């Protein structure tokens, strides 16, 4: 853990293979959504042929990851406490398996929903789970893997858009499957949100460690 020299943030970082399984899966999704009749209808609710791939190709270059605690080398609030935790120290470099339950896209971000296990939640902080919809959403609902971003969109947006998506998905206001994609059921949630509920949970290998950049 380097009890002294802290990273920019902790989190689960996907291996080279899992990273492309998810990365390429997220591309074909954006390729299907952009060519799907449902999405084409409500396009004015989302903005030529708007190729979603290029639209979401602004993510900061780097390895796909599910962040836990942003530390800023200890300058971020709570960083020192999180790193000094025994579970965090005893998990550095340990490999975990992250479950991807669904893909999603909004006018701002395009990400993947992560369903953390009981032990993975031991590393989930208790500050990154109380924005606006986290009240009534369970702990760890913000867990995600950012796959894409619009022009001026910070990756932190992806977690909030997920909570926005889940807040409606819980309220039964997602509606009915507007279509069945090869991977799962497409759902139109209005206000630009979309979800590909994966019929089969995508399993991705990931290592919990710190990133210094």
């Amino acid at each position, epitope marked *: 853990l*380097e009890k002294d020299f802290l*990273p920019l943030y902790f989190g689960w*970082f*996907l*291996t*080279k*293979k899992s*990273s*492309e399984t998810l*990365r390429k899966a997220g*591309q074909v999704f954006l390729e299907e959504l952009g060519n799907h009749k449902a999405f084409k209808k409500e396009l004015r609710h989302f903005i030529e042929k708007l190729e979603l*791939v*290029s639209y979401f*190709g*602004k*993510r900061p*270059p*780097g*390895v*796909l990851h599910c962040t836990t605690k942003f530390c800023d080398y200890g300058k971020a609030a709570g960083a020192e406490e999180y790193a000094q935790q025994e579970v965090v120290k005893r998990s*550095y*470099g340990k490999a975990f398996k992250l479950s991807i339950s669904a893909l999603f896209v909004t006018p701002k971000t395009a990400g993947a929903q992560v369903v953390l296990t009981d032990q993975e939640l031991q590393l989930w902080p208790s500050d990154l789970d109380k924005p606006s919809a986290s009240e009534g959403l369970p702990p760890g609902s913000r867990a995600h893997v950012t796959l*894409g971003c619009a022009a001026d969109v910070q990756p932190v947006q992806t977690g909030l858009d997920l909570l926005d998506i889940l807040q409606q998905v819980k309220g039964g206001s997602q509606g009915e499957a507007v279509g069945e994609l090869p991977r799962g059921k497409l759902y139109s949630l209005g206000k630009g949100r979309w979800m590909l509920s994966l019929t089969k949970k995508m399993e991705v290998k990931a*290592i919990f*460690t*710190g*990133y*210094y*950049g």
Partner: nanobody
Amino acid sequence: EVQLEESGGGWVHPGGSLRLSCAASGNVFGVNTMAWYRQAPGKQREQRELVASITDYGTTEYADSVKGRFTISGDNAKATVYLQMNSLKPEDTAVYYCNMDLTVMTATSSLYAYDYWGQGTQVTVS
């Protein structure tokens, strides 16, 4: 401890094509960016100009001088990049160096982003 290894390059008459590749050997955890710079005959290395770039996401940036003639490819899984050059001009003569912003895992499992350079590949157009 990664090593960048170029390939391709040669002597071509104006209007030909070569495919410059560049793999990465070692303990690379992931690729963040892959690019191709070039240094013309005479230049000093301080004047290495960007020729083509590619991101993990697949976003490409090119130089107008080559945009439409060259085409950068990629493969994050094998840490390999390609630069298929088309309709080559004499002004394209240079040594094409391979750049790679990569994430690498230290022994303590920590992750860092490193910038690696390649030795070079000779490209001649005449």
